[PDB]
Write a protein that binds this ligand. Structure first.
Ligand SMILES: [Mg+2]
Ligand SMILES: [Mg+2]
Ligand SMILES: [Mg+2]
Ligand SMILES: [Mg+2]
Ligand SMILES: [Mg+2]
Ligand SMILES: [Mg+2]
Ligand SMILES: [Mg+2]
Ligand SMILES: [Mg+2]
Ligand SMILES: [Mg+2]
Ligand SMILES: [Mg+2]
Lengths: 99, 167, 194, 81, 132, 101, 138, 120
RNA sequence: GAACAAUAGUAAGCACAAUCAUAGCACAUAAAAACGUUAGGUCAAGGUGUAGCUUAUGGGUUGGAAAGAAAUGGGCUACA
């Protein structure tokens, strides 16, 4: 290790774009975060979920517009119809406890 | 001195595809390409051919009506090169009460252009020689006493330019 | 009202050409294919299934649009678009004297709406050092300046750049690195005499 | 004129399917009796099952052409068509 | 007992399709994959988006062809165009087949922002491989 | 509708994480460097502690995109193991087979 | 016998710019099944011989990515179900090749890529020197 | 000029047809923009606002108004080295990061004075 | 409901077997293993029938989830 080698390493850092002056291993962290993509901005992170609200809303609108037919909501509608025909339905909001 | 470099060739992206379509000619036994060539879906007569083609076109129009009816479900883009025709189209005016924008916004979509002109005229906002030209062109492209009313609108309010008005 | 039609096999001639029937990629529609083709595990008394109503033939990729006669026709069409390779550059050694710099770049294709692969930004520029006008002292300063990017056995210098968003910007930065190494290798400074 | 249709671009000069089957109906009306059977049956299988399906004016005329040319073998296939 | 993707042995009268008649350990041995796409390779990205697109295609075709859809779809991905291959029974008129074909084409093209092909083969009944 | 309120809260948490992702980077750059004065660093800890809670990346939970199972999830497919097995045994995933060697 | 006439209409414009030369172009195809890769290799080699390229094709060794999952829903860790993904490689070496030929060959191969495979192209090209290095010194 | 657009649309309705060939479908989709442009490059359509490598790598011209000899220069050369190394971030957002740091050190002035070193 | 020098058994099919993978056979391993038994485990992967809430058994924020008197299972490191 010589001062010539120090100048060669510093010159190589200046031409290739690294940090020329000596820097701590703790202090190379800020270089690492500014060089890498942050974790919350990665497409795997924010685009992790499909837009379930738009999926459900689109497919429900197609169900009521009669281009797609949904057997599962047909099953729920028939079961709720049978429950209301039997007489045990969903009460109004605010009538259940006091009455 | 012995370096020989040939010159490059510049082509449009599909010229090679018409070069392949030059070799691939029409098929003698096949159906038209739009219809499915499954024998249940092969049209037996010309009435059936027109029926199937207009059924597919009505499906295209119905699905595009769904897209224009609910544009918020198609706002998310997955394709990164961002095809502009695949976005839903907005048929709504952008600014409601501003005459100088709402005029041309309702012209570029008959009744809406007339309502925008009436809203501009009721607030004493003077339509220039370009907005009146666009409104007259929109009235002529769509649509006889209302024609004379539009003529009185063209000439009575402003001295609108000939090269739009007589045209 | 149900209607049933015979397929195109009965109307197919003996000497008709196949690329006119199949221009592009196809899902193996079985009505237009005259070959009786069987795929599927048979029953102990049974036979493999025929081409109608079989999903395995629908699953399989087809080479029906890539028949060899169609390959001859299509390549005779692409013959007008190709250009000739120079006769003087036939050998690797003459390529080494004439064009010393080689540049590795990559393009990737995948099935999906997204084109961009983050590994496509890379540019790998390789130079044989014997083809340059480096002196003795400038050459030693070049090795001690670049370090690990130079091979001591095969005498080649390899600079890989990644940092630029575009491959053209990476190419410009790599050729800039090469020319600034060339200009700073010849400089003799005050601390070089110690 | 069929070569003229085929030369530059095939489909962009005829506007509608209606006038396109008018074209092919009168085209076979000419080609049936002013050419011979060897090319008539060969363009029969090229035009009729592919391009458009026949109307009555082009239905009657193959019948009168085979009656003129005394061709009795050709009847069942065109009947099935 | 292993119960995944298997049909149970009844008295001997239930019809079965070839895909339902093979256990999952016959995948890439005797039966193949119902979807083919790039993202499940070794050093390739974007598998989960293709997976959820695959799922939404299966449910949308199952509800779009109610009862006249015979069996499972074939989903091919080849240079951003998506080929959807179906076996449909002869139940609905061809008017309604072409209406649903054009509707599904335009809707999925504008929804996944990619070109779509709908390829159909229309059959008299469910194809029976065993039993019956 | 998402399938579960935990899924809905994780969507909102990812939303505030993307909304505040740059400011956390900018403040943590000042935090994680020892060249900076300690009088500045304790202040930087004060504005990193005064940020909203749900904007932090450690609160982001990787759940299944089908049924929102909190664990047993493969990172490549973003799917739970039961749903992954259900789609894999039906042959709906390319290149996946039961393993035999 | 219905032969349409004058089917050919090419558009080729020759620029004055020197064409780019590539030393070598590597096409590595990865797939799941071997037969598709074999037939695709036969297609690519036949197109190469008709284009006059004189290529060499070799098979890189395969790698298999293996993982283990639980067999049951709730609690059975002794019994597991394992899954396997198989990828296979075929590599085409393209030697002494030009720019327009590179483009048309690559797009002909790319449009005829099947559904279940991927590939990487690695282009190493010929370039003499930049204009600021040739024989100046500062 | 609406009538020129109407003339173009009436001529294009005559010109367009239902598709008779698969290759015709591919050329129409490529001219419309639906299909990829072959041969594929991964940066098709993204020019990064026409920027070059010198605006991405060398950030020295935005370090002009800084204390030249203190730890501020240390911190900023580490930050600009990270921004030069980062491939995923645009040059306008790098300018926004540098201006955010400038704004931060502009609002906080007194704490640099009681730090013990005088910085401008 | 069977006697092979055969005395009421035919039997489509599912298992076993055969085939397939561990890049050449073979062996070995893996994979497979029917109908059923234990009302065996899972309403907390997910959906669900039935029975219960709807200013709460629902939806959000903050702060906390201790600990070993004791016993025991499986491991890691040793006792050289
Ligand atoms: Mg729930
Ligand atoms: Mg966590
Ligand atoms: Mg039996
Ligand atoms: Mg073997
Ligand atoms: Mg054995
Ligand atoms: Mg086992
Ligand atoms: Mg066995
Ligand atoms: Mg119990
Ligand atoms: Mg529950
Ligand atoms: Mg244990």
């Amino acid at each position: 290790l010589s001062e010539y080698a120090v100048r060669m390493s510093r010159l190589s850092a200046r031409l290739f774009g690294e940090v020329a002056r000596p820097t701590d291993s703790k202090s190379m962290k800020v270089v690492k975060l500014f060089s890498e993509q942050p974790l919350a901005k990665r497409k795997e992170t924010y685009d992790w979920y499909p837009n379930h609200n738009t999926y459900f809303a689109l497919m429900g609108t197609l169900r009521f517009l009669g281009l797609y037919r949904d057997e599962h909501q047909d099953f729920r509608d028939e079961q709720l119809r049978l429950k209301k025909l039997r007489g045990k339905g969903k009460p109004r909001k605010g009538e259940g406890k006091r009455a | 001195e012995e370096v020989v470099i040939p010159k490059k060739k510049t082509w449009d992206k599909v010229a090679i595809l018409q070069a392949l379509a030059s070799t691939v000619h029409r098929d003698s036994t096949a159906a038209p390409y739009v219809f499915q060539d499954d024998p249940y879906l092969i049209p037996t007569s010309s009435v059936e051919s027109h029926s199937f083609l207009l059924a597919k076109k009505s499906g295209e129009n119905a699905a595009k009506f769904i897209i224009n009816s609910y544009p918020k479900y198609f706002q998310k883009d997955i394709a990164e090169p961002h095809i502009p025709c695949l976005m839903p189209e907005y048929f709504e005016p952008q600014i409601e009460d501003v005459s100088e924008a709402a005029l041309q916004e309702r012209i570029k979509l008959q009744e809406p252009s007339a309502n925008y002109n009436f809203q501009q005229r009721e607030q004493s906002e003077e339509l220039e020689e370009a907005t009146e030209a666009d409104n007259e062109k929109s009235k002529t492209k769509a649509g006889t006493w209302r024609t004379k009313n539009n003529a009185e609108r063209i000439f009575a309010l402003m001295p609108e330019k000939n090269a739009h008005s007589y045209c | 009202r149900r209607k049933a039609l015979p397929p195109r096999t009965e109307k197919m001639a003996v000497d008709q050409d196949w690329p006119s029937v199949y221009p592009v990629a196809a899902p193996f529609k079985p009505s237009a294919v005259p070959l009786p083709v069987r795929m599927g595990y048979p029953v102990k008394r049974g036979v493999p299934m025929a081409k109608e109503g079989n999903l395995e033939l629908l699953k399989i990729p087809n080479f029906l649009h890539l028949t060899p006669v169609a390959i001859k026709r299509h390549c005779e069409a692409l013959k007008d678009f190709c250009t000739e390779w120079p006769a003087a550059l036939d050998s690797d050694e003459k390529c080494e004297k004439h064009f010393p710099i080689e540049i590795d770049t990559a393009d990737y294709v995948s099935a999906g709406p997204s084109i961009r692969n983050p590994k496509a930004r890379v540019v790998t520029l390789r130079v044989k050092l014997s083809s340059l006008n480096l002196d003795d002292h400038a050459k030693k300063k070049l090795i001690k300046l670049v370090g690990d990017r130079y091979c001591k056995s095969t005498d080649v210098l390899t600079i890989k750049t990644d940092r630029c968003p575009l491959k053209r910007q990476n190419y410009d930065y790599a050729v800039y690195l090469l020319t600034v190494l060339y200009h700073e290798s010849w400089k003799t400074e005050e601390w070089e005499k110690k | 004129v069929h070569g003229l249709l085929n030369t530059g671009d095939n489909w962009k000069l005829i506007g509608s399917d209606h006038r396109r089957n008018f074209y092919y109906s009168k085209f076979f009306n000419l080609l049936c009796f002013m050419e011979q059977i060897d090319v008539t049956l060969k363009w029969y299988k090229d035009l009729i099952p592919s391009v458009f399906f026949p109307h009555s004016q082009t239905m009657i005329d193959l019948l009168q052409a085979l009656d003129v040319a005394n061709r009795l073998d050709m009847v069942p296939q065109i009947w099935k068509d | 007992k292993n119960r995944a993707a298997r049909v149970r042995v009844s008295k001997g009268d239930k019809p079965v399709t070839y895909e339902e008649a093979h256990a999952p350990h016959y995948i890439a041995h005797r039966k193949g994959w119902l979807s083919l796409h790039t993202g499940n390779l070794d050093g390739e990205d974007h598998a989960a988006e293709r997976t959820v697109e695959d799922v939404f295609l299966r449910k949308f075709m199952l509800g779009t062809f109610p009862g006249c859809l015979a069996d499972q779809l074939v989903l091919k991905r080849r240079a951003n165009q998506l080929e959807i291959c179906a076996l449909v029974l002869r139940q609905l008129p061809p008017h309604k087949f072409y209406f649903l074909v054009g509707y599904s084409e335009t809707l999925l093209s504008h929804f996944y922002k990619c070109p779509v092909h709908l390829h159909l083969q229309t059959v008299p009944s469910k194809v029976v491989y065993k039993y019956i | 509708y998402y399938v579960d309120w935990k899924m809905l809260r994780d969507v909102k948490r990812r939303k505030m994480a993307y909304e505040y992702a740059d400011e956390r980077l900018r403040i943590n750059s000042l935090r994680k460097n020892t060249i900076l004065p300690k009088d500045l660093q304790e202040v930087a800890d004060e504005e990193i502690a005064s940020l909203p809670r749900d904007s932090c990346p450690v609160r982001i939970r990787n759940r299944c995109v089908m049924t929102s199972r909190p664990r047993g999830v493969k990172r490549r497919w973003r799917l739970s193991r039961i749903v992954f097995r259900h789609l894999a045994d039906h042959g709906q995933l390319s290149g996946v087979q039961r393993a035999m060697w | 016998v219905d032969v349409p006439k004058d089917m050919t209409k090419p558009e080729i414009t020759i620029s004055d710019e020197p064409d780019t030369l590539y030393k070598r172009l590597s096409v590595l195809v990865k797939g799941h099944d071997k037969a598709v890769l074999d037939s695709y290799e036969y297609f690519a080699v036949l197109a190469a011989k008709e284009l006059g390229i004189s290529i060499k094709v070799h098979e890189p060794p395969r790698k298999i990515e293996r993982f283990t999952l639980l067999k049951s829903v709730h609690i059975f860790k002794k019994h597991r179900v394992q899954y396997e993904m198989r990828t296979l490689y075929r590599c085409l070496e393209l030697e002494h090749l030009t720019g327009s030929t590179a483009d048309v060959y690559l797009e002909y191969i790319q449009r005829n890529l099947p559904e279940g495979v991927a590939m990487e192209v690695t282009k190493t090209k010929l370039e003499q020197l930049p204009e600021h290095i040739r024989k100046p010194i500062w | 000029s609406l009538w020129d657009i109407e003339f173009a649309k009436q001529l294009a309705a005559v010109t367009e047809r239902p598709f008779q060939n698969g290759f015709e479908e591919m050329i129409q989709w490529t001219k419309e923009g639906k299909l990829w442009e072959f041969p594929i490059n991964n940066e098709a359509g993204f020019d990064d606002d026409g920027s070059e490598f010198h605006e991405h790598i060398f950030l020295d011209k935005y370090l002009q108004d800084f204390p030249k000899q203190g730890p501020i220069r240390h911190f900023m050369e580490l930050v600009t080295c990270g921004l030069s190394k980062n491939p995923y971030l645009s040059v306008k957002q790098k300018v926004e990061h540098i201006e955010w740091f400038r704004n931060y050190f502009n609002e906080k002035r007194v704490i640099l004075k009681e730090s013990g070193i005088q910085l401008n």
